[PDB]
Each structure stands twice: as structure tokens, then as C-alpha cells.
Amino acid sequence: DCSPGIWQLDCTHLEGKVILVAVHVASGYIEAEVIPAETGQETAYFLLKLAGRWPVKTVHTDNGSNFTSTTVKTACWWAGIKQEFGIPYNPESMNKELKKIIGQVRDQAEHLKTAVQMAVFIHNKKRKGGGGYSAGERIVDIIATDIQ
């Protein structure tokens, strides 16, 4: 479906903590991290990290206020990210599933942050089996083809 440089980024809450989830919209691949607080600095830093790893051209969010601080706009400026406008908003979600996966592994770990990376791993390696690729395989296929 979508252009290969579009990501969605949102926060969810669990155990009084904050989880920042990035989804590569064309593949369903996710990167996620437990942040100590839902702040502009945390998002800017996560954006730098994400952009260093994948070719990130536009990012969408379901809370536009998330991207208004100069701190975040400076990270996008530096990394060359645009904020996406082609996905409008209805008053996905691969955020519910990652909440279901976390509950399922929650007791395998003391910290939520560990349970989260467990769930990311399971999500990205899960064979979405129809011709049955995982999201980890799909992102790589999509970005590689878009190069070659």
C-alpha cells in the first residue's frame, strides 16, 4: 500500500509507564521503547535513532501535539524528516496486538521494558501466513526493492 518511508509514531501507557511505538506503515514492522516520560526530548531522541537505521522520510501520529516542540522539530530538521499529511484521521491498530503480546509474555520478565522487546520480537517474526512473510521480512523486502 503505502510509500516505504512512512512511519507512524505513538505513545501508549502500561503499568504507569510510557511506551513509544513506531510502525513502518507499509510492512507492519515495529520498533518500540519504554520511555520514562511522554516528553518532546524523548520523542526527538527516538526520532534520531529511528532515522539513523531506516530511510525515514515522513512520520504520522494520532496526536499532532506530540510534534509541536522545537526540540522535536529540530530532530526532524536535522534528520530530514517531514511530518506526514496524506494519512487523515478518523475521530492499524497494531498497538492493540503489541498490548496483547505483552500481556502474554509479561511474567517472563521483571521489567515491562524487557516484556516490550519480547513482544516486538514476537510481532516482527510472526509469519502472517497467507505468501506468508513476517513484518521483519516485509520491511526489508520493501526497502530493498525501493533501492533496486
Residue set of the binding site for Mg(2+):
10, 62, 92
Sheet holding 17-24, edge to edge: 30-35, 17-24, 6-14, 58-60, 82-83
DSSP assignment string, 108-145: G-SSHHHHHHHHHHHHHH-EE----EEHHHHHHHHHHH
**What angle do helix axes 96-105 and 112-125 make, rounded to 10 degrees?**
120
- The site partner of 76 among ligand LF2, ligand ARS, a second copy, none (C-beta below 5 to 8 Å per kind) is ligand ARS
Q: Which stretch binds ligand LF2 (CB under 6 A): 12-20, 53-61, 105-113, 126-134?
A: 105-113
- Interface pick for a second copy out of 37, 53, 65, 107 (rule CB under 8 A): 53
15 alpha carbon, distance to own chain's centre? 20
Shortest approach of ligand LF2 to residue 110 CB, angstroms? Answer: 3
Interaction of residue 30 with ligand LF2, rule CB under 6 A: no
Binding site, annotated residues: 10, 62, 92
Interaction of residue 95 with ligand LF2, rule CB under 6 A: no
Number of residues that bind a second copy (CB under 8 A): 29
Shortest approach of ligand LF2 to residue 118 CB, angstroms? Answer: 7
Residues 106, 28, 82, 33, Cα dihedral to 10°: 10
Chain contacts with ligand ARS (rule: CB under 6 A) = 10-11, 20, 38, 43, 59, 66-67, 76, 81, 83
Residue with cell 526532524: 76
